[model samples]
Target: SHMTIQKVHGREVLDSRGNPTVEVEVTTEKGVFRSAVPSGASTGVYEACELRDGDKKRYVGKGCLQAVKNVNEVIGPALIGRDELKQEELDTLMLRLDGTPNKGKLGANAILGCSMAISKAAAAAKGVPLYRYLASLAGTKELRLPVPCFNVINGGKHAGNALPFQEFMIAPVKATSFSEALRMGSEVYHSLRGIIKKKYGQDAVNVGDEGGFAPPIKDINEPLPILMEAIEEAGHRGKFAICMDCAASETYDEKKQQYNLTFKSPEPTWVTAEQLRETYCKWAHDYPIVSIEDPYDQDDFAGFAGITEALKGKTQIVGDDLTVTNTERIKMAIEKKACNSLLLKINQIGTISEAIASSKLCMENGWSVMVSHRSGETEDTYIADLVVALGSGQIKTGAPCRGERTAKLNQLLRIEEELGAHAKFGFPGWS
Candidate 1:
């Protein structure tokens, strides 16, 4: 018989940012399992709410006290005695209990913490690795590791710099295996650090919340050439492909219906969607860029589709802020032809079942999936297992520095070694 949940407890914990967040511990017949939730700075407006205690005195109004209470007082009793393996049923119960479209009442933070813990408990009950358990749940037979999209530069809201782009990533797409890809990422990361130090002095090498260098330069052209220098200096010039998470939702001017590319600067310069599209096309032509994420505002569907069509053959236009990992939004994006890839964040949708369904939906529609980590992260390696479970083909956890960022990357390395000859590494086809 599968194990039954005996107890569900919630506690307040600190994330990488020192902000209080929800962490849940589940006691099953098999063993105890725990999970922690992560937060994002450049969050989507359409994403499920990450509940916070509004008391200004506590954790600067970001405390998860209420979220923890909801888990202990409301969600715990309902989940106790339930079969740990019935992930869909348990998640549905929580959804119905919340009775909110976005799980706002129970709080996505609370629900997701519990949901993640349940999955871990289930894996323990089955006596298998979490990835194997998740693969079985996905009904996926083949297992593959994702190419790590190492975010080596940070800007936008994550840093004090003037660059509006949120992340500049390097993908070791040409590596033969996950270990080789990680090595390339580490070498390039160190090379980029040395280059930045030489150009901007020692303080310029300081890192952002996601462990990416936050140089003070404002020009959009500055980071790419530096990245190219690093790649070539590390002798991995052709082996790596570039990617950017524009996080344009943070730069959109609602009144003007335009993008302020220099929004982080003192001067306000706005560009229309067409102008932004042209710039992106030019970048794709000039650089070895294989992906661009959230180049437009979340509500700008036509803008997304336009770029998707314009760079159809050259780049994969990814939807992170636009889709928010919601099936409703993904369906709309599919109908609108808005993007070629979905950025999967488990907490965005608040349930493992729905997250998996969203991945399935994206893949079924011939779109690629990229599992992601938030700016505010924990040491949890859940997403590492998730990428292999879904065979998503890509992940962006941050540069190969910092414990919170490296935890996910290092877990993938262990998984690759454990899988031995069975492990496969490659990118998914863009449709």
Candidate 2:
């Protein structure tokens, strides 16, 4: 039953954002497996670095040739003949070989692809889903599927709107099954898009970077009301809840040391961190907002503390830029009481092994775990199963439109059926 790495290869592929990303394929003694890396639009500064080929002519300097080459030339040679079953050993070896604090030496992109591909190969050899194999590797038992937080509306960096938020998500928290939850989310998503077209003209239904309708309105509350109405109209008032991703680090002004939020132009309505916390408090009281992500500056840990205290258990204060999926940062947040949940982006910390460790740490600390995909995602459904296998009970894969985003939604649909009576929903600490 031995599964050793027999071959490793890499290729350049186009992501949803039309950018080039690295895709690695690993062949083990018993089976073949593959995985790809996703890039982000509102990336945190502290995240692990990804290797890219900055050739001005190629893919407008966002090409991943160097990363692909690293897989084919460097990482591949080093990983050959290694036991695919020992994910930790293989991952640790890659980390040591790179010998960089952030995995910049061989590129997190290159390393993660190999890491995931090998793990996937190992699972295939054992006749199991990647999530099941992953959970077993991490010593995690009691599997459960996660509630999908589908981004129904895209704004800020993910959209061409003046709205101060990035994602307007819907979580079918009360759905008994993953399939039913997705159904409720999809219905509301379509209903909201219909209202957007009618009220703001057909152009309002146009999708943004993450495939959510980027309504032409700049008022944040505009979409919120529409979403609320759509949820009720779809006959799911109590079953669904809303979440927001501010991604406020994208709008923070370093020169003035203030937060800038606005509809379009005109000086960007600057406010202090305290005022920003008040704004979040107002939204919490006004809407059925279950979670708020990156509500303020990334560097202002105390500001996050203030916001977290104001919202408390009523709303899940998700740490995205503030934590960046790093265990140390997560520990610091726990110490500061900064957030109630952590956003687990595989590329943020860059390997499944490390991500699993981070997510487990969050769960141990009574903080919820949310497995997320980037705006520049691919058609890979790795994160979908990753959440289910770990029973993290949360997933944010943008809207249920587009192949890249819907691929995850559809994958969960399949897995829930496969698990049948065993698949469970809802995690602890969710609002």
Candidate 3:
């Protein structure tokens, strides 16, 4: 009945540039676990825990490694030799041992660690995958799986510019089950590639760093046609659905109340309100875009409402920078009907509880929620779990490969395997 800390290890992963990436591993008396190699704008890491209850085994928690380390140093010593299978009691004990203020900080990490251990114990006790445990709890045979969309643009063309927030995305909008979802997603990827090659030429469509719309902040005039061509080609046969980063550049003049897609400086540019409306209208008409993130500067509720009103039933206009997953901001958006969707980011609000609460609020208001990863990310699968548990199937983890992105993908795969035929849902569909 005892759970003991056994060992810890670290490994290096490589990025596209072949840079070193850090991944950590932790071992407990019951089992072994590894952390996902962290990447993206949010640098949180993940570590796993293996536990043995009796003769069977199970696993839990797959995101945020630092949290796992903290659990080992602070929470593990207190729980050793205790009934490892007492999940609820153990969760409470771990919370108390870590204390209060630290609760929010260390709470998720500890919860995940304990959850992992408990899942392992339960699985070992029951001889089933972790998903099976979830199914047993739900008294349902199936779990709905998620479809991932890659985040193409980071900050901007420059190391951290503000305009053209997102470069491109490929998501599976049509599929009934896990297998079909993956197959459709893969097809979308290829379809996008063909369009990019046809429009940008094979050389312009490089897969390396420069290929991803590197920015000295190209003029909207030039990039517009290029982007339009790509979109046109992508939608020719209805191969895939599109979404825009619309990470609004500072050019959105709050004073003038318009979007200056072109400005010499990097900050807000001046334009008439009419131009702002026109840009969104044009983009919505041109692309097979179903989701638009950050259509206006973060503070421009009026502008957000403007775009939302224009495209109400046409597509979903999501607010990321505008809302930042804050409930107050979301409530305001809901009241104003600013947009039809929200981009959920945990770190933006700094706690899983808060993030989930915000998601619930959005759902209540008829707003779709898209769980997202930051430009800086760690190998944490927590978002994946939360997305599935909450039944929000849309996730933005970036393209395939890399540990951070793969962690979520792997978790989804495992969930699908565990749930079998029942874990199926159509990918986020287009309007």
Candidate 4:
């Protein structure tokens, strides 16, 4: 039987900034499903899903509820009555629906909704977890466990910027192949959680805490004891590491100690290179951070290389804004030796094929790859699959939330189950 987009409904969801997000509700004849928003969320929007198959339960997508509505109603009607199980046909259809000349008129949410519906259908048909399907397709049975995850900066101006979320942490998992990588990843997660909770106080640590810079480490003059204590308490000896995401720009005012950058306005602000470097060096001393992202303006390749050279083996200097997943930019960073790791985002380059190519390039060059989510998300579970498929080092989906983030987590758990004894290493760094 062919699958189709039966119906879609939308509603408003509010965010921390008081924005109204349009959430979508989708109902398909084969099954009903919802799509939620993605991670690093914003704009008072999310994705949500509920599915029912002839009184049999199906799958639901969760996250920013408000955003999914746009896709469900706007894009789903075009998909009804087609074979829900025919993934290749569905992918081709989606491409046709959202392809050029239309130029984003359907928007990403529509494609995302379609993807979720298809994934759920496939999982249901297989009677196995989504990750298992992925693993089987990838030709592996051993699931990676407890993948090590890292939060570079949690607060401050750099927190929600365009930079890749994690600036300074390396998950210490040793896996040569994709399946082994996933198993080790699971182990890393458990180890880090126990350590983070013990050292930072359970309340002090959370998934959101993993990204961005800690305020205490922002000051060079601050005693290293504060950071060292957190590390010790978190149970990370020198093996595990932390990072800094400066997301610095010339507009920063060192004299006034103020950040002139604002989402509301994108104008040139006057700040000197020396001032930014001074701030970066100061922040570096107090923290055990081994990674730094966007420590200078994205255009400043020289500055990035300088920082990388200065830190050398002590830290991994990464580029997010500098690369933005563009092949040209990534090649530039590589040629310049600007950093040692490439923060990989599937959407940034806009497709699984492109992302895989990028990952392969980085891996071949001996640089670590970290799959990530955008500030806005959906319960796509695509990144999780990609992480496993490509053996990326880490994934950054925000502090666990209702829709997309949770969906990925659930998918990971399901992957763990299918892997059996191998599942124990599901988190990032354990292997």
lDDT score at residue 290, model 4, on the 0-100 scale:
56
| Candidate 1 structure quality by residue, lDDT tens digits, 140-257 | 7778899989889888885878888789888999988899999998999999999999999998998988888999878766899898899999999799899999998898889999
- Residue 114 accuracy (lDDT) in model 3: 46
Q: Please estimate how well model 3 matches the true structure, expressed as its whole-model Cα lDDT.
A: 0.55
Candidate 4's residue-wise lDDT over 1-431, tens digit each?
A: 34444555554453222333333444555455543323333210111112111222312233333234435554556555555556556655665665642214454434544554555555556666555554454444344543434433344333433222223443433333334433333344444455445554655444343322333223322323444444445444454444455555433454564444332235533445666666556656655555676676666778888888877766666666677554667788899988767766644443333445566677677776666665445545666765655545456554333354456656655554555653444223233
lDDT of 3 by residue, 303-359 (tens): 789889888877688888777777878888888888878888755554344566677
TM-score, every prediction: 0.98, 0.97, 0.66, 0.62
Stretches of candidate 1 exceeding 4 Å from the true structure: 428-431
In candidate 2, what are the lDDT values of residues 133-177, reduced to their tens digit? Answer: 987876767777788888888888647777867888888888888
Clashes of each: 0, 0, 22, 86
Better of 2 and 3 by lDDT: 2
Model 4 CA lDDT for position 193 = 51
Best by lDDT: 1
Candidate 2: 10-residue stretch with minimal lDDT: 422-431
Question: Per lDDT, what order, best first?
Answer: 1, 2, 3, 4
List pairs with backbone clashes in candidate 1. none
* Local lDDT at 373 for model 1: 91
